[PDB]
Amino acid sequence: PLLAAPLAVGDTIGFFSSSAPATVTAKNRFFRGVEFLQRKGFKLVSGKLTGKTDFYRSGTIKERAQEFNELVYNPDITCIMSTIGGDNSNSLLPFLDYDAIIANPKIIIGYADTTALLAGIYAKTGLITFYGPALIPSFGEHPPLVDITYESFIKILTRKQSGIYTYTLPEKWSDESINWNENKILRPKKLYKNNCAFYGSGKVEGRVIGGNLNTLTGIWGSEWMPEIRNGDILFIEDSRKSIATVERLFSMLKLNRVFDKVSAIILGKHELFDCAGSKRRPYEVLTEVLDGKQIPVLDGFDCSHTHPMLTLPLGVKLAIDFDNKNISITEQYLSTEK
Amino acid sequence: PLLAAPLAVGDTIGFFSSSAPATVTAKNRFFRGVEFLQRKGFKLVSGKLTGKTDFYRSGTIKERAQEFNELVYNPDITCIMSTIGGDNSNSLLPFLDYDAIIANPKIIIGYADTTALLAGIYAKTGLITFYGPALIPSFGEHPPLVDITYESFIKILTRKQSGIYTYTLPEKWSDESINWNENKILRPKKLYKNNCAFYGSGKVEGRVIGGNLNTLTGIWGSEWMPEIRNGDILFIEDSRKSIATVERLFSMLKLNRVFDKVSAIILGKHELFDCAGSKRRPYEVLTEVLDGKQIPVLDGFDCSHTHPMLTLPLGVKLAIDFDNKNISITEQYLS
Numbered sequence: 236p237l238l239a240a241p242l243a244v245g246d247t248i249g250f251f252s253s254s255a256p257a258t259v260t261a262k263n264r265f266f267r268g269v270e271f272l273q274r275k276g277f278k279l280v281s282g283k284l285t286g287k288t289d290f291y292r293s294g295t296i297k298e299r300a301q302e303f304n305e306l307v308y309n310p311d312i313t314c315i316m317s318t319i320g321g322d323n324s325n326s327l328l329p330f331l332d333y334d335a336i337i338a339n340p341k342i343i344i345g346y347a348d349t350t351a352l353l354a355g356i357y358a359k360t361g362l363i364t365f366y367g368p369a370l371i372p373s374f375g376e377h378p379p380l381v382d383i384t385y386e387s388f389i390k391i392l393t394r395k396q397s398g399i400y401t402y403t404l405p406e407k408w409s410d411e412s413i414n415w416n417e418n419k420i421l422r423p424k425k426l427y428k429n430n431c432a433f434y435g436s437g438k439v440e441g442r443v444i445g446g447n448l449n450t451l452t453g454i455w456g457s458e459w460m461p462e463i464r465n466g467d468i469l470f471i472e473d474s475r476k477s478i479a480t481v482e483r484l485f486s487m488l489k490l491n492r493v494f495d496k497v498s499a500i501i502l503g504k505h506e507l508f509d510c511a512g513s514k515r516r517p518y519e520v521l522t523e524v525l526d527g528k529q530i531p532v533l534d535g536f537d538c539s540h541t542h543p544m545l546t547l548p549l550g551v552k553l554a555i556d557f558d559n560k561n562i563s564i565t566e567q568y569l570s571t572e573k
Numbered sequence: 574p575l576l577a578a579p580l581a582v583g584d585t586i587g588f589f590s591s592s593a594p595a596t597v598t599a600k601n602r603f604f605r606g607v608e609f610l611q612r613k614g615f616k617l618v619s620g621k622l623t624g625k626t627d628f629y630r631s632g633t634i635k636e637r638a639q640e641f642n643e644l645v646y647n648p649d650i651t652c653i654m655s656t657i658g659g660d661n662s663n664s665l666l667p668f669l670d671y672d673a674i675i676a677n678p679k680i681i682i683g684y685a686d687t688t689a690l691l692a693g694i695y696a697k698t699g700l701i702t703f704y705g706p707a708l709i710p711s712f713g714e715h716p717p718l719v720d721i722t723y724e725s726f727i728k729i730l731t732r733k734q735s736g737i738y739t740y741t742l743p744e745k746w747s748d749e750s751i752n753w754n755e756n757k758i759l760r761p762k763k764l765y766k767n768n769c770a771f772y773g774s775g776k777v778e779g780r781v782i783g784g785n786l787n788t789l790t791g792i793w794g795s796e797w798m799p800e801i802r803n804g805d806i807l808f809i810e811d812s813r814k815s816i817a818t819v820e821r822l823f824s825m826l827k828l829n830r831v832f833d834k835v836s837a838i839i840l841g842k843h844e845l846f847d848c849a850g851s852k853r854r855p856y857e858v859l860t861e862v863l864d865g866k867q868i869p870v871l872d873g874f875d876c877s878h879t880h881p882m883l884t885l886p887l888g889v890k891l892a893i894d895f896d897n898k899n900i901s902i903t904e905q906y907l908s
C-alpha cells in the first residue's frame with residue numbers, strides 16, 4: 236500500500252469540513268478541540284470553509300472538494316483531519332485530486348460520514364487512511380475521555396513501525412448525548428465498564444476494510460467502494476440507529492455476499508442503539524441475518540461514535556485473537572521516516 | 574418480460590407484511606383499507622403474519638418470507654399487495670420462492686420499503702411488478718383522495734392491453750400528516766394544486782426502473798438490484814427526508830454512473846421534504862449533482878408517498894412527452 240509519513244509532536248494538522256458546518260454550529264466545542272491540540276504542540280491550518288454555512292453543509296460540492304484539495308497541496312501539512320461528519324462527503328469524490336494525493340501522501344483521518352472519503356481515497360490510490368478522531372466531536376470532548384482518545388491517536392500515528400501493535404482496551408466508555416457545545420459539562424457522563432465481547436476462537440488475521448456502514452451505502456457499487464475480498468476482516472460501526480435500520484444494513488451486506496468472503500467481523504460500539512423495546516443487541520440481529528454462517532465477531536471495538544475512540548488504519552492487516560481477547564495491527568501503515 | 578394476468582373486479586387479493594407490523598399498530602386504518610376493497614367487490618386473503626408483532630417488524634426474516642411465498646402458492650390469488658412498508662423487506666430476498674413466482678406470475682404491488690421486493694423479484698424473474706398502493710397507507714386513506722388512488726389502480730390493472738396508456742394528472746394532492754389511524758377525521762387534509770413540472774423538450778421513451786431510492790441502498794450492488802441500462806428512465810421517490818440525505822442519495826447514483834445511462838428521470842413528489850431552511854427542492858439538488866448533464870426530468874409525478882397515488886408498472890417502456898407534458902405506458906405489462 237501507499238503510506239503517509241508518520242506524525243510527530245509539533246507537526247501541522249489541517250482540518251476540513253466535508254459535510255456539516257460544525258465550526259459554526261458547534262463553535263464552542265470546535266474552539267475547545269482546537270485549544271486541546273494546540274496545547275499538545277500541534278500547529279493547525281484551518282480549511283477555507285471554516286466559519287462558513289450553506290444551511291445543512293459547509294459549502295457547495297465543489298467548494299468542499301476544493302477545501303480538501305487545498306490541504307493536500309500544502310507541503311507543510313502532515314495530517315488532514317475532518318472537523319466533523321454529516322451526510323454529504325460522498326458528493327466530493329469525483330472532484331478530489333487523486334494524483335496530488337498520490338504525489339503528496341498525508342495522514343487522512345476522521346470517521347462517520349467521512350468514511351466516504353477514507354474508503355474512496357483508498358479505492359483510488361491505495362493510500363492507508365485512518366478511522367479515528369475528528370476535531371470537533373473527538374477532541375472537543377470534555378475530560379476524562381478525550382485523554383484516552385488522544386493517547387491512542389498519538390500512539391498509533393507516532394510510534395515506530397516495528398513489530399505488531401496490540402490495542403489497549405479503554406477501561407470505561409460512554410455514549411451519552413450530553414455535554415456537547417458549552418463551556419462546562421451539565422453533569423458527568425455515565426461511565427460504563429467495557430463490555431466488548433470476542434465471539435469465536437483462535438486467531439484471525441486479514442486486511443481490515445470498512446467504516447461507518449450507513450455511510451458506505453453512499454459509495455456502494457461505485458469505483459470508490461473498495462472491493463471486499465476473501466479473507467478480509469470487515470470493520471463496521473453505526474450511530475443512533477434503530478434496530479430496523481441495523482437489520483436492513485446487515486441484510487444489505489448479506490445480499491452482497493460479504494459474509495461469504497470475510498474471515499471475521501468487527502462491530503464498533505453502537506452509539507445509543509434503539510432496540511425498539513426488543514432488548515436485542517446488534518450482534519443478535521447479525522446472527523439472524525447470518526443464517527448459520529459461522530464468522531467470528533469482535534463485538535464492541537472502541538472505534539466508533541462512542542467515547543473514547545481508538546485510531547485504526549484501514550486497508551492493512553489486523554490480527555484478532557479470540558482466545559486471548561485482543562486485537563493487533565500486523566502490517567506497516569506509515570512510512571518509517573518523514 | 575414475464576407478465577401477470579390482469580386484475581378483475583371480484584378477484585382475490587392477498588396481503589402480506591414484509592416489514593412494519595401495521596395491521597396491529599395502525600389497526601383502524603388497516604380495517605378501513607380492508608373494508609374499502611371489499612366494498613369494491615374484492616375478496617381478501619390475510620397473510621399469516623396479520624395481527625402479529627415482533628417489536629419493529631411483523632416476524633422473523635424467515636417467517637416473513639414464508640408469509641409472502643404462501644400467497645404465491647395460493648391458486649386463487651391474482652394480486653399480492655403489501656400492507657405497508659418499513660425498513661426490512663430486503664432481508665427476505667434470499668428466501669423468496671422465485672421459481673414459484675415464475676411458474677405462477679401474479680400482480681405484485683406496493684411501494685416504499687417494498688421496493689426491495691419489487692426490484693428483487695424483477696431482477697430474478699423478469700416479472701413486471703407494480704409501484705402502487707399498499708393496503709394500509711393507500712386504501713385506508715379517507716375520501717376524497719383514496720378514490721383517485723383507486724381509480725388509477727383499477728384502470729391500470731384491468732384495462733385492455735391495446736394502445737398506449739396516458740396518465741391523468743391528479744388535480745390536487747396532499748402530504749399533510751393527519752388522519753392516519755384516528756377513527757374520525759379532524760378535518761379534510763389541506764389540498765395543493767398539482768405543481769408537477771416537465772423539465773426538458775421532445776419525447777423520451779425507455780424502460781422504467783427504480784422505486785424508493787433510500788430503499789434501493791439495501792439491495793444495491795447485489796444480484797437483486799436490476800441492472801440499469803443505457804436508455805432507461807429512472808423513477809425515484811423518497812419520503813420525509815432531509816435535503817442532506819437527498820444529496821447523499823443523488824450523489825450515490827452519480828458515483829455509480831447512473832446519470833451516464835438514463836434518458837430521463839422521474840422524481841415522485843417527496844412527502845414532507847425537509848429543506849433545512851434552504852428553501853431548495855430536490856430538483857435543485859439533483860441539478861447541482863448532475864454537474865451540467867442535460868437529463869430531462871419529470872419533477873413531481875404522483876407515484877410516491879403523497880396522496881393520491883398512481884399505479885406504475887416497473888420494467889416496461891414509458892414515453893414522457895416533455896413538450897406536451899404527459900407520460901404514457903407504451904409496452905404491454907399484463908398478459
Ligand SMILES: Nc1nc(=O)c2ncn([C@@H]3O[C@H](COS(=O)(=O)NC(=O)[C@@H](N)CCC(=O)O)[C@@H](O)[C@H]3O)c2[nH]1
Pocket residue numbers: 255319320321322346347348349372412413415447449450473474475506540
Ligand atoms: N448532542 C449533540 N448535538 C449535536 O448537535 C451533535 N452533532 C453531532 N453530535 C455528535 O457528533 C457525532 C458525530 O457527528 S457526525 O456528524 O460526524 N456524524 C455522522 O457523520 C454520522 N452519524 C452520519 C452517518 C450515520 O449516522 O449513519 C455524533 O455521534 C453525535 O454523537 C452531536 N451531539
Ligand SMILES: Nc1nc(=O)c2ncn([C@@H]3O[C@H](COS(=O)(=O)NC(=O)[C@@H](N)CCC(=O)O)[C@@H](O)[C@H]3O)c2[nH]1
Pocket residue numbers: 593657658659660684685686687710749750751752753785787788811812813844878
Ligand atoms: N401521519 C402519519 N402518522 C403515522 O403515525 C404514520 N405511520 C406511517 N405513516 C405513513 O405511512 C406511509 C408509508 O410508510 S411506510 O412504512 O410504508 N414507508 C416506508 O417504507 C418508507 N418510508 C421507507 C423508505 C424511506 O422512507 O427511506 C408513510 O408515508 C408515512 O407517512 C404515518 N403517517
